[PDB]
Design an enzyme around this catalytic site. Structure first.
Site, PDB file in Angstrom:
ATOM      1  N   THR B  10       0.808  -1.213   0.000  1.00 47.65           N
ATOM      2  CA  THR B  10       0.000   0.000   0.000  1.00 47.65           C
ATOM      3  C   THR B  10       0.848   1.273   0.000  1.00 47.65           C
ATOM      4  O   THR B  10       2.066   1.258   0.121  1.00 47.65           O
ATOM      5  CB  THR B  10      -0.943  -0.046   1.215  1.00 47.65           C
ATOM      6  OG1 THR B  10      -1.956   0.948   0.984  1.00 47.65           O
ATOM      7  CG2 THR B  10      -0.224   0.202   2.534  1.00 47.65           C
ATOM      8  N   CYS B  80      -4.366   0.142  -0.307  1.00 43.20           N
ATOM      9  CA  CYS B  80      -4.556   0.881  -1.540  1.00 43.20           C
ATOM     10  C   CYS B  80      -4.026   0.163  -2.776  1.00 43.20           C
ATOM     11  O   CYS B  80      -4.261   0.609  -3.896  1.00 43.20           O
ATOM     12  CB  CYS B  80      -3.936   2.274  -1.415  1.00 43.20           C
ATOM     13  SG  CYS B  80      -4.713   3.305  -0.185  1.00 43.20           S
ATOM     14  N   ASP B 206     -10.310  -5.272  11.427  1.00 46.50           N
ATOM     15  CA  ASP B 206      -9.516  -4.213  10.846  1.00 46.50           C
ATOM     16  C   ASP B 206      -9.976  -2.874  11.421  1.00 46.50           C
ATOM     17  O   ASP B 206     -11.152  -2.559  11.336  1.00 46.50           O
ATOM     18  CB  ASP B 206      -9.677  -4.287   9.325  1.00 46.50           C
ATOM     19  CG  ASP B 206      -8.789  -3.367   8.543  1.00 46.50           C
ATOM     20  OD1 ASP B 206      -8.464  -2.244   9.051  1.00 46.50           O
ATOM     21  OD2 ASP B 206      -8.428  -3.763   7.410  1.00 46.50           O
TER      22      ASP B 206
END
Lengths: 256, 256
Positions: B10, B80, B206
């Site tokens: 990410t 991401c 998470d």
């Protein structure tokens, strides 16, 4: 007692090598700084921009310059980091409570700066799958190297776990010993480097800084104190992290 | 079966995040590539040189270009990295056996490329001690960020061990989401990205990609398969490494 430890990685490495030791020292109450030297770790420079071991040392010198008056640190250098220590001590001796050598080169004041590197290369001449290149900086040809993965696995990280060896494969970078530049450098000074307290930590199970070399260094330039760690490997801060922290605590309680 | 997994970190991270997973997958017999994206890990670029998520993706695109004809890979993207997957799949769809999303953004083909990022920012608006800056590249103002250490400790690395959190403090770098650049980018294509098999892996523990967000993503763009990992944290490749490897083995046995 509490101290401020400044952890100094070797060539081709970065602050990341200290990722186990730093939290352990903090859990003892110490302050810890783990630097990336020039062109190392996540420093933005590439090695071909760097012309000497002194330029390589810039982040350590800049850090020491930034300490306010009266603040002292304990330097801890692994492998080639002992050369960074000697460079730093010739500029900021008053800021150094002690230096700890961790399977490290131990430069002296009677021979030129390359002396112990030259010896290392005689004791350990075959760097296996390590690759070499040359670049030019400030009118000198510099030999760069990239540590071979077999050398890393077998000789530096011998007993480290696979996840640690993986970090080394991922993060080790092109570097240099700057051996020929060291050979021409002015000697380390007796007033500066020679005056600091020097603690030599090693294991006789180190598969690159072999016992012949380490015991030769100790005889060549007598340390103030020697600690031999039983077992482990060259990367004692990974394989014997707790033992290294216990030694460093004792150093903090002895030298200020 | 054996596969070639390409692990994609990410923003603000690097290949190093995969240092536990990569050897475990290799111990199952797989090939593994763990890339540093532009201005990430030990890549030599700084983020201010990078003008879009597509430029950020260059090392992944270059790697895929280098695969000989007929060789397929399984892409695995964290956080991401799902955006890197979508970019890659619109150039090299034929080289992708499947994509695995690992607590990752899941872009779609019906909404603009920023859509799931925009949603993430609504679900998780407070990035704690994260700092921001702006730079200009290719005539656009880009928002850069440096992930806060409290955010790292509490929300990304919640259950990771202190030595793992230390690596993140040492190695995370300035990065960008390129959110406004994504907002203007052409949509991901149905023929390319839309056609690849998509496996969504997540944990409801998470603390940054919260359950509301992840379940919203799953409903928004139905995955081919969903795996929920019990426990762990956002960095499942650190806290649930074995479970992730077992899932990836099943993916390798299902999609080729």
């Amino acid at each position: 007692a509490f101290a401020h430890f400044v952890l100094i990685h070797t060539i081709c490495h970065g602050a990341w090598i200290w990722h186990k030791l730093k939290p352990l020292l903090e859990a003892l109450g110490h302050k810890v700084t783990a630097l990336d030297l020039a062109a190392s770790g996540v420093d933005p420079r590439q090695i071909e921009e760097i012309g000497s071991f002194d330029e390589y040392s810039e982040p350590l010198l800049t850090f020491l310059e930034a300490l306010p008056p009266g603040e002292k640190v304990i330097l801890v250098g692994e492998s080639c980091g002992g050369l960074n220590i000697a460079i730093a001590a010739d500029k900021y001796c008053e800021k150094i409570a002690a230096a700890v050598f961790h399977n490290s080169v131990l430069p002296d004041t009677e021979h030129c700066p390359s002396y112990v590197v030259d010896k290392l290369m005689e004791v350990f001449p075959d760097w296996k799958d390590t690759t070499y290149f040359t670049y030019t900086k400030d009118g000198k040809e510099i030999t760069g190297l990239k540590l071979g993965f077999t050398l890393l696995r077998e000789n530096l990280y011998t007993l480290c776990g696979p996840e640690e060896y993986e970090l080394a494969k991922m993060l080790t970078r092109k570097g240099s010993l700057f051996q020929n530049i060291l050979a021409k450098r002015p000697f380390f000074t007796k007033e500066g480097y020679g005056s600091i307290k020097k603690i030599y930590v090693w294991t006789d199970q180190d598969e690159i800084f072999l016992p012949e070399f380490q015991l030769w260094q100790i005889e060549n330039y007598k340390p103030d104190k020697v600690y031999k760690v039983e077992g482990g490997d060259h990367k004692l801060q990974l394989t014997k992290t707790k033992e290294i922290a216990e030694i460093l605590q004792e150093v903090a309680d002895t030298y200020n």
